[model samples]
Target: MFQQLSARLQEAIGRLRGRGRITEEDLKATLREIRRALMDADVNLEVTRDFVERVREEALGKQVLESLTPAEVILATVYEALKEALGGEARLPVLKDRNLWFLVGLQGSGKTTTAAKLALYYKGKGRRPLLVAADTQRPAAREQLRLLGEKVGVPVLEVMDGESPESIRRRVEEKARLEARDLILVDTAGRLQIDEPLMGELARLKEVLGPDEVLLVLDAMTGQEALSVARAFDEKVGVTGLVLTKLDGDARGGAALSARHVTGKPIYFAGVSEKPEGLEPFYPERLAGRILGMGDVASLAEKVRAAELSLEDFLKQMQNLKRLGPFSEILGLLPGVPQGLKVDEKAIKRLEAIVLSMTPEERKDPRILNGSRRKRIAKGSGTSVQEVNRFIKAFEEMKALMKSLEK
Candidate 1:
């Protein structure tokens, strides 16, 4: 999501990485580049300026001018500033024997879907979650929640026509008690824009439900608009945390980068995909590392373990890699990987085809692949022999790189 910003920052920082000393002019130049990158990414103007200013002060105080590794010190200063802007630490809702979480956002912000995702997440955590479809304004909103609730193996408490918020709250409480559900997610209605009626309805629901957590679901693609939306929601009905959706999309990541700073709210979760299991806890340290091109080995290791990856078989390993989310995101978590490296789906499919076309022996030991064998495999895979040769060369290079990393 922060691909463009990440690349620009890396480019600006990489120039000074091994420099023994840095002048004030050099630091200013690099900070200017970073400022432009933040602006291009649609970060709030004030936030961007403040971030650059804070980094400048911190760098000067940290002795970037006289430190043995000036660039490293500057990078550390910037990383700290970035982490603070990202809320400094991860925060989740306070769960109790009974937890009520109200999901709020503008229309098309994926609020309903995020509610289901939250339910599924808590369910996996061994919390019996009950989904409350309280969106009465939008037609089929409650139905959507019901369907998702079924998919998530949770019960949905649908509000009847003209049901008051008080009545709905009571019903949900009773339902949770009867079903022994501890976590209750209430999906509220949203408008195309902020309006009194919508705000009044939300306030009424908030008053009645008294949610333990009010999470504002934001679409990362909304860019600067997300900041304003976050402010409106927090002002009207109060927001405890944020949930950024569509992070897997081609969003420049302005919302994800600026929302917490603008709203003074921690981002509790990020909606990475449309799937039920796509919700992930927001980790500020890991996100800052990713933005600085430092990679997030921690999250990568978790995904690898969760996928139960077996590296003994190359083809099987590729299949397991698919379970670890998009290849680009996975690559983004690895140290020293270049940003904006587009490994398209077709390229991955072609690689799999080439591997499938190979003989078992050739697959196990590629050194035995003669010219004729390569030609046959290429024809079998419906690709040219030159492409096959290039694939093998790339594979060897990757293997060598992996071995080096292992060391």
Candidate 2:
């Protein structure tokens, strides 16, 4: 539920830059933007206050690590707080003994579909997941989840009409044990904004089945209301973690910014892009940089050279990034380029090697990369001409943004 916040933070923090060494006035300006950004993102006042203070303290005490400009330094500091809030490198909840995970949240929180997404995610990982329809109260929740299961190739454990959640959990657990399935995904009934009955029912289900993970599915569009609903569920049913849906769409990342710190639960995964394969493990540093509107090309490069690059080279690049800039040729970072960041190094390096194979003339001066050069580079990189051309365009745009930020 952080869509509005993510967008606002991006607007506020993206401008984190200055030409020369950052000074006190620059940091104050940065802090002001950060304050406005956090407040606007629907972050709690107390939490935001402490968060800004910590960021200010750490930033002022340390040298800028990522951005060259003072403004960029402050933005990176603010992002550190965001990373902390989103849970520092927390993995999605998985289990060895327990077999089921439940999506618990009030109505309209996007729990039903999140349930399917979770099932699909596990299924793709080679686990045979079973979808358990626990909330017989919500009219279409069961049917909708069943449809999602069918689409994802997971089996749904449907019960007789008018079943209680406790009965559903019990039957599903018993059946799962017999089936020896890897996972059981439970879907609860949707609740209204202030529906107590639904919430109480959720608590009862938790006690009955004792699920491995109580994943609170939330809508990024709901902002403050989403946080409140999460707080209530955490207090009552005690959610294990969170799965934020529609994050890659219109929603800002406000709820994610405040979730962990507010409710004491980690954000496991965020539904960023539409592709089912787009789901990824949440990384604090990358996301923090994203919230601040800074491209995470450094992290991408580091992943590539994990086996080939020396420790000295990696440290040198990070150290230089604080002052001059990143190592271009090594990271396949031409003047500028970006990618859909992930932890996969082999895939990223493959993309890098394609760019690296460019002729020295083209690398030195991209103006030399005409249609023929593009075709040649594409062939050398084992990619399509279209992909090479797209990379060039993106590099041009990023380089322009960086040059504009020049001191």
Candidate 3:
């Protein structure tokens, strides 16, 4: 996530390191690099301009010039500007005795999936959530929501074809009361484009549901187009917050970086994966840290706790890492880690296979693996002995790193 932008930004900041003082020309040069990076990342032109100008003004101020660590001051200023562009602070739907959240988006924005993810999220927080499949336009949208609801272990109220918004609302109210559910997530219809009829239908549904939160789901892969989509949805349906889907994809990071600035709406959550457990609350500070090459240790600790990771068993540890999203993403959350480490999925699979081939005792204590045992394990995992040795060396290094991080 934001890999290219992160790398470029770090490079720009790296030039200022070890400098006692920075001249105006030096600041302009750094800001020029940053401006090019943002433009290449596909950030909205207006947003990029505003961010650069803000950073420039702050960097030129007397506070930065008079500070002993001018580079650090400028870096701090950039972090703050980036945070503001990324929505300043984290925001989540307010939990109440009864909460209704309406999810709206264009077609293929992962609206229905996000609704179920929210249900799972709130359920994990000890709230009884009810899912509502109110998409009457698409044929299998309701079925999809039902399947997701079943997977999430939540009751879903399906809307029939051509069902009136009023009737749907009445049924949802009745279902919530019967099930004693405290939170309700309604997955509304979407279209291929922002059509007038679709907007009208969404507005009508919004009126009937009277949701406490109107979340506009945007696809991060859409890049600059997400800005217009956000503006259109906010104008027609009045979105209260944003949920950026597919943040884990190979997007240029433009949509996520620019959405909040363009729409003036806080991003409440981000869809990191297609699974129910893949949704995460958007934290601007943590994300800004990640983007600036200051890894998010806090988020990494939270993921470690959530995954219940234990280093006692190698195979189990591997499984736990899988639970924490992509290896690159997890690495990005660690402090002082290098950006754009190219560890592909195949490499991860091979590592897991090697661990699987190990005996229980050997996995528990790799020291027990003699030369012959290493060769046997390598053959069992369909790799050479050198590859097995490399894997063991990498594992030991990672274990040491984890121990140090724990300290």
Candidate 4:
């Protein structure tokens, strides 16, 4: 989501290095790049203004201007504002305080899916969370949650017909009490505030449940529209935290950068990839570092560790990615490799075909893929020995780079 902005920010910020002195004008130009990056990422007008103005004020401050490393100081100042806008330090959900949480957002905002992801997130934490299908109005809402619930092995408390959200809550609460569940997630339909009865129902449900959080699952691709949604939801129902979804979607990622600032809400979670496991806790400081092209190696390492891939599987994928050559290896070494990127499907298929023609031992040790084996693999895979050799060489180098990265 911050793909374009990250590139631009790196380009703009990198220009400041090695500069002996940074004038207010010089810093202003850099600020302009950041401003444009945020704006292009779909940041709200007021939030963008606040960010740029705050950075400018700090950049022009006497102490900052006279600093030996003026450019570095300016960069630091901008990073501070960005960190503030992104909800400051990582304040994770106080799940121990209250088990209940309400997931609310507009239709198509991925509320249903986020509900499941949240359950999975807590489940990984050893908390038994019960998913409630509270959004009865949306078509297939119940079935969707049921499927996702099963997928994550979390039980669902289905909403019954002729039953308003209030009734659903009562049933869910009762079930949770009986099961001694540590968490309960309520999934709500779109425009819960605009819908007369629906809005009242959501507020009252909170009244009854006293949930630990009422998170707004905003679609990151919605741009300024996402800000509008966040503002309205916060105004009417008091959104606690934000869960930004579809960051994989082609958008500037402005919603994520702006939503928290506009609504005065913390972004607790983000859907960086597409699957249920794609959800990640929002880290403002880490993200600020990444956006500034500082290379958030900590976050990158954590992502690799958090990924649900077996050692062998991850190594195999790394082998396939050898096609991107040394450049890809270098990027993978650096922090913040966007999750959506993958080798071409056709290329992967061809590579896999070649792999299938090889013996098990050859699969483990590509160095043994000498002339005879290469010829047999090429003939069996309907390709030439040259392709096999290229793949083998790339795979060996890629494996070495990946091993070094693990160090």
TM-score: the better of candidates 1 and 4: 1
Name the weakest run of 10 consecutive residues (lDDT summed) in model 3. 308-317
Model 3 misplaced regions, further than 4 Å: 60-69, 296-407
Alpha-carbon runs more than 4 Å astray in model 4: 39-42, 57-71, 164-166, 191-194, 296-407
**Candidate 3 displacement at residue 406 in angstroms:** 60
lDDT of all predictions, in order shown?
0.76, 0.65, 0.77, 0.72
* lDDT, residue 89, model 1: 78
Alpha-carbon error at 345 in model 2, in Å? Answer: 47
lDDT: worst 10-residue window of model 4: 308-317
Clashes of each: 0, 13, 0, 1
The digit string of per-residue lDDT tens for model 3 on 283-307 reads 8888888778686332332345447
Q: What is candidate 2's lDDT per residue for 167-263, written digit by digit as tens?
A: 7767887777887787888887665543445566677877877888788877765654466557656766788887776565433455667777767
Give the winner by lDDT: 2 or 3: 3
Q: In candidate 4, what are the lDDT values of residues 1-407, reduced to their tens digit? A: 26676667667667877787767677768888878877766666678889889987877774655567766766788788879888888878775844788898877778888899889988898898999887656547788899999999999977776576556667887888898898888786654223335656677767776777889888887665566567556656778888888775633657677676567878889877776678889888877887776764323323454472222343356543452334655567678564435564456545655654566566667776679778777865656899778877776776777678886
**By lDDT: ranked, best first:** 3, 1, 4, 2
Candidate 4 scores a C-alpha RMSD against the true structure in Å of 16.7
lDDT of 2 at 31: 74
